[PDB]
Design a protein around this nucleic acid. Structure first.
Ligand SMILES: [K+]
Ligand SMILES: [K+]
Ligand SMILES: [K+]
Ligand SMILES: [K+]
Ligand SMILES: [K+]
Ligand SMILES: [K+]
Ligand SMILES: [K+]
Ligand SMILES: [K+]
Ligand SMILES: [Mg+2]
Ligand SMILES: [Mg+2]
Ligand SMILES: [Mg+2]
Ligand SMILES: [Mg+2]
Ligand SMILES: [Mg+2]
Ligand SMILES: [Mg+2]
Ligand SMILES: [Mg+2]
Ligand SMILES: [Mg+2]
Ligand SMILES: [Mg+2]
Ligand SMILES: [Mg+2]
Ligand SMILES: [Mg+2]
Ligand SMILES: [Mg+2]
Ligand SMILES: [Mg+2]
Ligand SMILES: [Mg+2]
Ligand SMILES: [Mg+2]
Ligand SMILES: [Mg+2]
Ligand SMILES: [Mg+2]
Ligand SMILES: [Mg+2]
Ligand SMILES: [Mg+2]
Ligand SMILES: [Mg+2]
Ligand SMILES: [Mg+2]
Ligand SMILES: [Mg+2]
Ligand SMILES: [Mg+2]
Ligand SMILES: [Mg+2]
Ligand SMILES: [Mg+2]
Ligand SMILES: [Mg+2]
Ligand SMILES: [Mg+2]
Ligand SMILES: [Mg+2]
Ligand SMILES: [Mg+2]
Ligand SMILES: [Mg+2]
Ligand SMILES: [Mg+2]
Ligand SMILES: [Mg+2]
Ligand SMILES: [Mg+2]
Ligand SMILES: [Mg+2]
Ligand SMILES: [Mg+2]
Ligand SMILES: [Mg+2]
Ligand SMILES: [Mg+2]
Ligand SMILES: [Mg+2]
Ligand SMILES: [Mg+2]
Ligand SMILES: [Mg+2]
Ligand SMILES: [Mg+2]
Ligand SMILES: [Mg+2]
Ligand SMILES: [Mg+2]
Ligand SMILES: [Mg+2]
Ligand SMILES: [Mg+2]
Ligand SMILES: [Mg+2]
Ligand SMILES: [Mg+2]
Ligand SMILES: [Mg+2]
Ligand SMILES: [Mg+2]
Ligand SMILES: [Mg+2]
Ligand SMILES: [Mg+2]
Ligand SMILES: [Mg+2]
Ligand SMILES: [Mg+2]
Ligand SMILES: [Zn+2]
Lengths: 102, 252, 58
RNA sequence: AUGUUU
RNA sequence: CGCGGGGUGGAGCAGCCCGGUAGCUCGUCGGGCUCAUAACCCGAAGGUCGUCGGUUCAAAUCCGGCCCCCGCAACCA
RNA sequence: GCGGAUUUAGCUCAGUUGGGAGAGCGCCAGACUGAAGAUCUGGAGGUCCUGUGUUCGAUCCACAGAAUUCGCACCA
RNA sequence: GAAGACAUUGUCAGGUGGGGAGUUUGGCUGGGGCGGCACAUCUGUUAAACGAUAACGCAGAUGUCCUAAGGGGGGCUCAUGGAGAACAGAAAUCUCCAGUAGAACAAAAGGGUAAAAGCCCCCUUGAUUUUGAUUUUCAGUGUGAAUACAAACCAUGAAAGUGUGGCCUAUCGAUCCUUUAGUCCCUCGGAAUUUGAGGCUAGAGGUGCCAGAAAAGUUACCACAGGGAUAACUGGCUUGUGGCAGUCAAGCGUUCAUAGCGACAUUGCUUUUUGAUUCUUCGAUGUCGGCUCUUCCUAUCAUACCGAAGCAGAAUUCGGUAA
RNA sequence: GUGAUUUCUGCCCAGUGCUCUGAAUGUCAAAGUGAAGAAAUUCAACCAAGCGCGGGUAAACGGCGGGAGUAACUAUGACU
RNA sequence: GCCCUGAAAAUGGAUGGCGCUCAAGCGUGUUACCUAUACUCUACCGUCAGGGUUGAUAUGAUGCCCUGACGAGUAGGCAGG
RNA sequence: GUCGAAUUUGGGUAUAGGGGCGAAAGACUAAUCGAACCAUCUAGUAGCUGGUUCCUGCCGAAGUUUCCCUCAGGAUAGCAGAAGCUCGUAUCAGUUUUAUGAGGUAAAGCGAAUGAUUAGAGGUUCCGGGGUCGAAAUGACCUUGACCUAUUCUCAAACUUUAAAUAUGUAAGAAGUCCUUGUUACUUAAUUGAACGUGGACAUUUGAAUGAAGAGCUUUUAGUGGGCCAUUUUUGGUAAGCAGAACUGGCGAUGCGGGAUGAACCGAACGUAGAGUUAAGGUGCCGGAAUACACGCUCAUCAGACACCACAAAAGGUGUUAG
RNA sequence: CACGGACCAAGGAGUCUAACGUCUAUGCGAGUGUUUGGGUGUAAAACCCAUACGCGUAAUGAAAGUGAACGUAGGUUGGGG
């Protein structure tokens, strides 16, 4: 799919609360941090003897991930998240469809 | 899931050496003042068979320099050594067959046997029948003697280490075919319980890595890593190469 | 071993043993899905009606 | 340096 | 996910290691030498450097995303 | 019988994204030779395995077959 | 004597390590395995005109695709056929006429649609925010999908209106954990500030066995609980297949259908074939073949007596009574 | 491992093993080092063996092709 | 229509058997008759329901009495013994 | 088989269970070996098999929905019992009638759409054209078509204009109807409308039939979650006492009379007895009941003799009977 | 022609406990529970008892926290008595 940027859409920033311009980027998960309580608990459980102590997922079935748009209001910097349907190719750039061309 | 035969050998229950009929450990004299500074003369009283050993042993009687008595020593007889022969052992003994000399005191090219790896160890190298060590040179500074071992390996030994001039008697022994399972039986009856050998491929998988299968076959490479563990080291351990050897040996 | 997959056999008999009961209609039915604007105005209309009827009971 | 048959 | 390395004429490589600039061999074609062939000799044609963007008085080169190949290492929904 | 594959000028084959039926070995013709072989040029050669449908057309997008083959067909 | 702050030894860390330890190694299934997915789903039919409705039924389809192929508005009308114009024919571009949709609407099928839902153009982000209600699946739980409102902010149009993704029916995902966004709100419990961490609300990283364990084989050395809920034997149903027998009569039989045969068709019988099924037997009906022995059936090879012949004799063939 | 004697033991190191090389060489743990921070900590560089890179090895495990045209009858192909 | 040919299987056997021929067979019609734990009436047992009766000698008011209807049963539930 | 050396054998000794030992069979290791024996953990766990102990009375099932690593199990809903509770002018209903909807199956249709499908006819030579001329053009014909026109024979689960029967939604009143006018922040141009109201009027039939051991309500729990059979509709299969669905009735869970016999068929469902009458089925004898009555048909050297049901077909016969 | 049962006697299988749901009976009732313990005793009994504690009388929110009358504790409809 092809999604444009700058997204005139609703903002909840408590200052706009209205339709404003939103820059669009693709959400990225972010590095899993140590000292998060689940990671601390998992490391403590994995220490010592006993082997792997929690499931490790193997039976993968999805061939796509759900694209998430991080939408940033250009005036108040408030961010919103929009989920798109599953797609195999996602582009943020332009090159819109041109009709009647050879 | 069963302990294999080469693992069971280490416990030494039925795999110990059959030493009842043996004449005693074959050793040079204790390296003492007489051998360190001059020489000592002994007499070959008997040349006797040693059970489990191809080479004959020589009983050499010396005089105890510190107490009035005789000290019998069990040397490995070199070829040409005879009863009633005077054996001379020490730094100042002559270059004659049967004499025990420090490796540094012999010229290059000398053929010695029962050679000590370290001075005073009373003999470690070239002890089997027909085997011998070749002196190939000396390093008088930081005194060392270069020798060639029966395996062809070059070794640097202390020049104070002793050896018996000549070749170990009983050579040519392995040239005669045993010709008989009975002769192999009587050979190993007086050495150890290492015969006969069942092929691991003729066993079941529980007994050996080579066991099992609807045909007798190894199934995986018989060359086994040096870092493998006990129960895995069956076959050709840490083999550099395999197959029929063609060409010349002594890689350098 | 395969087995039966589905049947509605005996289901009507089971349902009619305790009978099919009509759903007990009530007057003043619930206003659950009623238009919330109408409900909001209805609350104020009923409040005003109650206050008028209370004040007019002299 | 090479170049096949009659 | 991480760290790296590689993509250059039809084919195999250099030039990249800091911009002075696209080259070497095989291959193709034309001619020459030979009675003829190969070698040989003289020419011509062949990529503009994996795709875009970025920094440069004038970048294949330096930088950032992306496509493909390989090695190692990592794995709680 | 199931799971697969391939079917293109006489032979081996490349097509293929809704390009366009083409290349070598064959054959023919002309070169060269005294004449052959070898080479070097030019040409023809299919109604793309058959029949029916969907596309603007179609090996190629696209249905029912046909032919050639590979693997499996086991526990009593 | 050698050796020397190196070996060794202790701890941690990386590699190696079926030598060994523990465990696992789906389900449906006309037995199981192989195959397939009927396992989560959608269209038409089966399906018997409310709804619901099964089979490894039938014909197919889904894990995508689309910043437009979403939304609004305007203008226009499509497939096809006929008649016309240089190159240009049978397909190019131009013109008219007819044209109820025979086109197109992303995909499978069904439905729907003509001043439109189709084609072209213009503007846009309603594919937005908040949390409820409702329909299908249904336990009236979840998830997915969808419907109608409310409270905002927008888009479009002159406007009425329309828009909370795709004209509708499929196109998808719990707990825990991680991560992001928001509220800049609560807590870190002796009191504070700043980092950090934990909370609340909303998403994402996924379980396709799709209400969602983390999982390779082999056993002809085998074990246990069971199962006739289930295969391998007989028996029972059936008789596709096998075997056997009829009816017609185009033809063969030199002529001549029927001496003997007999096509194209069609009606049967039998359970000595092999299938189909799984009703009996898995706390056990001894599982091939041969040997031996008795009896039974007749669809009769021979023998008895006969009828018929393409029966001169002989031999033979067809048939009847006959086991 | 094979299994008296006799006669031999052919080709293949691509795959899986085994083995030899080693600071030219990518990846690479703990400890240690540097930077930032108020610190927890984060990042970076360095980074042993191993793997990778290069070589050897089959009396190691093992493996060791297909199609069609062609010879004064047919046939088969020495041949290509 | 009935009958016959078509019409062949294995232990000896089956309109149930015997047997039956203007049937004791087939088609049809009319009566009479036989008998279920079914129907009708009555009696008794129990269950359920609706009632009457503390006005005493009435010591059994969960008692006594009146009326009507009902009674199959695995798994299972409850009650009285 | 072997019998003078890998010989046989006593005693001593060593090797002990994931261990030993094995000239190798997974062999032997005290009748125990693909991991000995003994005791304990241990009454190990078992969705699996077996059993589960007195009587009577009343009520009385399910093999179905959804979910599950689920398919021999469970949860869930349903069926059932018990306890009851609130009332009982009464409430409702596996039913009809009236009024009003919905459906796309049976049937029907194809000179109606789609898809099939048989044949002839007439127009298309500008029909696609070919043969043959035409010196050649389709120009003259012969004519194979390919269309068009009007006909014609036969069809559709995934075709249809039409369209049943059965089944199915709703309504048949006091929670109704009618008249006047109060509230609102909704809505309207507007007391305009919407909803909820105050007040007033209408009881014999308060607005069809029939019935009503009453209606309504609540809690909590058992078992069940293998089903099978019959008529009818119906899918796969040649078919099946096969396999899978729909409605109902049954068997399971059910005795009794009949079908000789039999889970399902017919009749009828059951406290203990008496009497009468019957059902289905029977009345020669077995065997209770007419060798009854009446009209005909049949002679079988395999007659025939009551549905389910225990079989028979095509084709034939101056047998006989009636047309 | 599925399994157990040759016979008989005796034994022989839904128990108790901790914590609970519904229902019922009893006591008290916005309170309730004496029995941890103490006092007492005819001594494991019976009798008596303080302070606590549990549950209930308040909920809601993750939490900080806040915390239940406009009204005759409301209006309308039905409602036994
Ligand atoms: K652990
Ligand atoms: K093996
Ligand atoms: K291992
Ligand atoms: K296993
Ligand atoms: K048959
Ligand atoms: K069995
Ligand atoms: K190799
Ligand atoms: K190799
Ligand atoms: Mg720790
Ligand atoms: Mg650790
Ligand atoms: Mg050997
Ligand atoms: Mg051996
Ligand atoms: Mg063996
Ligand atoms: Mg092993
Ligand atoms: Mg191995
Ligand atoms: Mg074997
Ligand atoms: Mg079932
Ligand atoms: Mg010549
Ligand atoms: Mg293991
Ligand atoms: Mg299975
Ligand atoms: Mg329906
Ligand atoms: Mg429009
Ligand atoms: Mg869905
Ligand atoms: Mg709107
Ligand atoms: Mg998710
Ligand atoms: Mg979290
Ligand atoms: Mg603290
Ligand atoms: Mg599931
Ligand atoms: Mg069975
Ligand atoms: Mg047949
Ligand atoms: Mg038996
Ligand atoms: Mg028997
Ligand atoms: Mg016969
Ligand atoms: Mg041999
Ligand atoms: Mg070889
Ligand atoms: Mg480190
Ligand atoms: Mg290294
Ligand atoms: Mg007959
Ligand atoms: Mg009779
Ligand atoms: Mg009669
Ligand atoms: Mg009676
Ligand atoms: Mg009473
Ligand atoms: Mg009863
Ligand atoms: Mg074996
Ligand atoms: Mg027990
Ligand atoms: Mg009952
Ligand atoms: Mg699961
Ligand atoms: Mg069972
Ligand atoms: Mg339909
Ligand atoms: Mg029809
Ligand atoms: Mg069950
Ligand atoms: Mg069955
Ligand atoms: Mg049962
Ligand atoms: Mg019955
Ligand atoms: Mg009968
Ligand atoms: Mg009688
Ligand atoms: Mg007939
Ligand atoms: Mg039987
Ligand atoms: Mg049993
Ligand atoms: Mg028994
Ligand atoms: Mg007893
Ligand atoms: Zn904003």
């Amino acid at each position: 799919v092809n999604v444009p940027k700058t997204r005139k859409t609703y903002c909840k920033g408590k200052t706009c609360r209205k339709h404003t311009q939103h820059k669009v980027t693709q959400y990225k998960a972010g590095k899993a941090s140590l000292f998060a309580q689940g990671k601390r608990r998992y490391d403590r459980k994995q220490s010592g003897f006993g082997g792997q102590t929690k499931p490790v997922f193997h039976k993968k079935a999805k061939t796509t991930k759900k694209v998430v748009l991080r939408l940033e209001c250009v005036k108040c910097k408030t961010r919103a998240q929009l989920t798109l349907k599953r797609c195999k190719h996602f582009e943020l750039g332009g090159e819109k469809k041109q009709k009647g061309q050879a | 899931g069963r302990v294999i035969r080469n693992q069971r050998k280490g416990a030494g229950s039925i795999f110990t050496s059959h030493t009842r009929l043996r004449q005693g450990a074959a050793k040079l004299r204790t390296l003492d003042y007489a051998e360190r500074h001059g020489y000592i003369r002994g007499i070959v009283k008997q040349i006797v068979h040693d059970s489990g050993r191809g080479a004959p042993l020589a009983k050499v009687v010396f005089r105890d320099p510190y107490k009035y008595r005789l000290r019998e020593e069990i040397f490995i007889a070199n070829e040409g050594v005879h009863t009633g022969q005077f054996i001379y052992a020490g730094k100042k003994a002559s270059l004659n067959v049967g004499n025990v000399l420090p490796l540094g005191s012999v010229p290059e090219g000398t053929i010695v046997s029962n050679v000590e790896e370290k001075p005073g160890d009373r003999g470690a190298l070239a002890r089997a029948s027909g085997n011998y060590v070749i002196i190939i040179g000396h390093n008088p500074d930081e005194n060392k003697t270069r020798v060639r071992l029966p395996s062809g390996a070059k070794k640097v030994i202390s020049s104070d280490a002793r050896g018996v001039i000549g070749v170990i008697a009983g050579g040519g022994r392995v040239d005669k075919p045993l010709l008989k399972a009975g002769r192999a039986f009587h050979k190993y009856r007086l050495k150890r319980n290492s015969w006969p050998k069942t092929r691991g491929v003729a066993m079941n998988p529980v007994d050996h890595p080579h066991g099992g299968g609807n045909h007798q076959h190894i199934g995986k490479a018989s060359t086994i890593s040096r870092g493998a563990v006990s129960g895995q080291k069956a076959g050709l351990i840490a083999a550099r190469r395999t197959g029929l050897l063609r060409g010349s040996q002594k890689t350098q | 071993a395969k087995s039966k997959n589905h049947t509605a056999h005996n289901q009507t008999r089971k349902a009619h043993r305790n009978g099919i009961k009509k759903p007990k209609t009530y007057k003043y039915p619930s206003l659950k899905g009623v238009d919330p604007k109408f409900r909001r105005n209805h609350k104020h209309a009923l409040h005003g009606t109650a206050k008028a009827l209370a004040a007019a009971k002299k």
